């Protein structure tokens, strides 16, 4: 806790720079670059760390403006220390100017105002005053005061701009009769009369109505009759269209229920006869189904069942059950930890655990409550499920299969078979993890694999380069999981363990290429191959093993066994690629 480090952390702000002399006793170094003064008054700088002697110190009394403090209060998210710093700078408060004024005398002079101290103990007093100044600026005091005064000044400003601050008579007779015409036409055409002085909206209304002849020709009555007529045909056509479309809707409902009841074949046949009749979408399909292919009663039940579905839909519209609003809070995202408990509060209303193929039903009311894929989707969303892990899990809810080859519209998304909601979308596989995890270690594994081919017997011709490349791709990620001699020995252990996996794989699967060792029978025990490969590895790499004073034959045999297990666990049974 010497004075030097205290002066050192004094250096950090842009305030309090250094005057430096080559002939003094103080010596501190900065933490970053510092812009400093000197005797003879030259303004220089110093790098992050450099031995600088301290002639004295000067705290600058930077004078801000009240506008800066008002702007920060408008931002209104600043720490009290910065607000108080600026307020003292902007003459709004009197804290920094008080904690200072420990001047020995005006012994040095430059442009800006400030406190100057060039002594041995008054510099200590300056440091103490500075530390206590920021201690006050950070403490509980000066935080109530500055925040309160900032709020008061903002409120006073809002009062300044709030509390201290903030014709036609009669038209002409021609325009009087024109506005009478517009008043009478308002109940007849999309026109509303206004009373502007410039007569201009009236002019646009008359121009839009296609009849500007009121201004000079007193023939307004014929246009009034014209507007009445046009409104009449408009209403007639509107009512005709409404009747036509309700007839079309009812006929389509009838045919949809026919399709759902009697099947696609009979319904499409009846569509065919109606199509070569000009009477499709007219409820004479009732008569067609009466006298064709079935009895009159089987169409009477269709009509009554249509009315029943209409009544059920009306009742569902009348629904005001609690569950409905809950579903809304389940469909807003909004903080997964809350939608999870929303789903918890909803699942108590299920009836028969409704795993698949149909809707969940509300016991409180009786209508549909929540499709199961929605429950699973909510569970996955609250369960940190990725999109791919979410798209694949919601595949047992996939919609209509190759039953429909296509609806002539190309779709890239799956839908739920229970309700039709879009589950997810699939366009192409990402295929960016294909690049998983130094040409030197790769080249070493490749070269050592090529050397191993000299004692391996293949039951057919094999591409030795393709073999070495596959061995690199298997061994390299595994060696990285575990150019010093120990890394080389691990790479060798894994290559020989990979060769043992290929021998073992060829013994287990007769479809794989038979792989053995020269002079050994294909049916030799796995322990005979292990013994040979260990002896061969110990003989061939004795030079590398002798560089590693901590490696024992038991350590090599154990790491070889663990390498072999790791290769089988990650890669399984491997074969090398009739005539």
């Amino acid at each position: 806790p010497i004075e030097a480090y205290i002066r050192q952390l004094l250096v950090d702000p842009d305030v309090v720079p250094i005057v430096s002399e080559k002939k003094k006793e103080l010596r501190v170094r900065p933490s970053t670059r510092k812009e400093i003064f000197l005797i003879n008054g030259t303004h220089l700088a110093v790098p992050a760390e450099a031995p600088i002697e301290i002639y004295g110190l000067k705290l600058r009394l930077k004078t801000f403006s009240p506008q800066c403090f008002m702007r920060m209060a408008e931002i209104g998210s600043f720490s009290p220390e910065t607000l108080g710093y600026v307020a003292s700078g902007a003459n709004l408060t009197n804290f920094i100017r008080v904690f200072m004024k420990c001047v020995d005398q005006e012994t040095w002079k430059k442009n800006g105002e400030g406190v100057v101290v060039t002594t041995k103990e008054n510099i200590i007093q300056f440091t103490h005053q500075y530390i206590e100044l920021y201690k006050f600026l950070r403490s509980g005091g000066h935080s109530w005061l500055i925040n309160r005064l900032a709020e008061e000044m903002v409120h006073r400003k809002l009062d300044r701009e709030d509390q201290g601050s903030h014709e036609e008579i009669e038209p002409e007779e021609n325009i009087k009769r024109v506005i009478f015409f517009l008043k009478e036409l308002s109940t007849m055409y999309s026109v509303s009369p206004v009373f502007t002085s410039g007569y201009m909206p009236l002019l646009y209304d008359l121009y839009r109505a296609g009849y500007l002849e009121v201004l000079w020709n007193p023939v307004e009555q014929k246009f009034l009759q014209h507007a009445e007529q046009r409104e009449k045909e408009q209403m007639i056509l509107q009512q005709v269209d409404m009747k036509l479309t309700e007839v079309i809707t009812q006929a389509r409902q009838y045919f949809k229920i026919m399709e759902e009841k009697i099947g696609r074949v009979q319904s499409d046949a009846i569509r065919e006869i109606l199509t070569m009749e000009g009477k499709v979408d007219d409820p004479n399909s009732i008569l067609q189904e009466v006298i064709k292919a079935c009895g009159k009663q089987e169409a009477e039940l269709i009509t009554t069942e249509y009315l029943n579905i209409k009544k059920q839909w009306e009742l569902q519209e009348k629904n005001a059950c609690a569950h409905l609003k809950l579903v809304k809070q389940l469909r807003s995202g909004l903080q997964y930890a809350e939608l999870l408990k929303v789903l918890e509060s909803i699942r108590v209303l299920y009836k028969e655990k409704n795993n698949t193929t149909n809707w969940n039903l509300c016991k409180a009311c009786g209508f549909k409550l929540l499709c199961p894929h929605v429950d699973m989707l909510i569970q996955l969303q609250a369960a940190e499920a990725s999109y791919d892990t979410m798209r694949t899990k919601l595949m047992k809810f996939s919609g209509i299969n190759k039953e429909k080859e296509n609806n002539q519209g190309l779709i890239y998304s799956y839908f739920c078979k229970i309700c039709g909601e879009e589950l997810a979308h699939f366009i192409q596989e990402d295929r960016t993890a294909d690049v998983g995890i130094n040409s030197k270690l790769r080249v070493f594994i490749w070269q050592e694999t090529m050397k191993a081919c000299t004692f391996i017997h293949f039951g057919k011709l094999v591409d030795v380069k393709q073999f070495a490349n596959i061995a690199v791709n298997v061994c390299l990620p595994l060696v990285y999981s575990i150019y010093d001699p120990l890394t080389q020995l691990y790479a060798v252990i894994y290559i020989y363990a990979y060769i043992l996996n290929l021998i073992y794989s060829s013994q287990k699967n007769k479809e794989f290429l038979t792989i053995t060792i020269h002079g050994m029978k294909a049916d030799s025990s796995l322990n005979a191959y292990v013994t040979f490969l260990l002896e061969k590895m110990m003989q061939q790499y004795s030079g590398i093993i002798n560089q590693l004073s901590e490696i024992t034959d038991q350590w090599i045999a154990n790491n070889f066994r663990e390498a072999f297990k790791k290769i089988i666990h990650q890669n399984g049974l491997q074969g090398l690629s009739d005539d």
Binding site: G76, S79, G140, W144, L145, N147, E151
Partner: protein, 335 residues
Amino acid sequence: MIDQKIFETTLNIDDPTNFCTNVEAHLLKELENIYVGKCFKNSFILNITGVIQRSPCFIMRTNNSGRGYMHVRFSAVVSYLNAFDLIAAVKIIKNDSNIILGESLLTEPVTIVIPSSESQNNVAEVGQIVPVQLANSSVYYIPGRQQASATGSIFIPKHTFSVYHVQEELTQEQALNLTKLVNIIEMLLESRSKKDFKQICFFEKLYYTYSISSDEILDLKIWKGPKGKEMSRLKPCNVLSFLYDALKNKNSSLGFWARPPNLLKSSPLAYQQDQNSFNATELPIICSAEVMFVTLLKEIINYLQFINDLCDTFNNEQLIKRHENIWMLIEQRKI
């Protein structure tokens, strides 16, 4: 503390037509739904007192949604927690081999991170409640959180103090400003007065710096508490009436001011001298009367609130005697 503040924000109105039917009601409802109970702009909003200014309901220009937005400037009552503040209700939630987390049960929702490396806070019990002293660090107000993140420690009364050398006095406005502080003092003091004296004196005696075995009922006709040690021939001066008379300008506040450990902290009295007779190990702090008055009044506020919260939480003997190992550690560190 609990104090007023002004914020500016922009609100999105999904359906402008319904919103404009009752603009003030909808605006207050939406502001309360969005900002009440969360940390925003280096503060924790408690209540939305009102809206001072607002913009016309504009229609968003950069998309085809037809949705609206409004600029709202609103005044709200918020809480800012400082350093070295007293919280008398901190329930320990997590006590693992790495870190200790406690939660406050007061009007300042704050999570306390207590370092488990000091003998005071190393041994505790999960579910126990304890007063906590805040360290000399800013309280973190991460936006959007339901709580304030701040470090703290179990409050052990200290043996040190500070001495303020005041050379410049108040003016009329600088005392009318401290009138609000003395109003807070008198409100907290009425709150103290409306409650029975047994637990008041128990807590005050237990958090006295030294050991108070003798019983005294020292009265000032405005503040009541147990009397402790004195300092030779020095007689305290009530800072409340002192500031009142200074506003009346019939007294001079210059000199040395001190709040020694032996002094009754929650009382409005403190020491003033023409020359330091105090055996302080810290250099006197040269300053004016603004800083010393605000610091002393803030300290009185903090200790009064601490005692009031202690008596509010611990109602019967079961609460006080359930945590008596904390209190035992408290007696173990007093002179």
